[PDB]
Symmetry: C3
Subunit: 38 residues, 3 copies
């Protein structure tokens, strides 16, 4: 990547995808609670 | 320096969040292990 | 050098993210397995 603008664009894409992984992780953690809870 | 400092700041905040999430993954793995074992 | 250091740091973030994606996928697969069998 040659420009600041491009590095920032790529970083934003990572951030957006990560936002989604965090949400999915939260949902998985809930499913672990349910299994523990029985 | 303004653009470089802002990109660095943002990258550092991402890196920190990723270190946090890895700690949470470690804890969740422990809980999965307990469900698999017991 | 800066653009180079920034690129390096971005590449490390990207790599870490790919690791995270893989860990999460492995975690989810184990939960799935526990849920069914």
């Amino acid at each position: 990547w040659g420009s600041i603008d491009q590095i920032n664009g790529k970083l934003n894409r990572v951030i957006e995808k990560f936002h989604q992984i965090e949400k999915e992780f939260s949902e998985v953690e809930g499913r672990i609670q349910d299994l523990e809870k029985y």
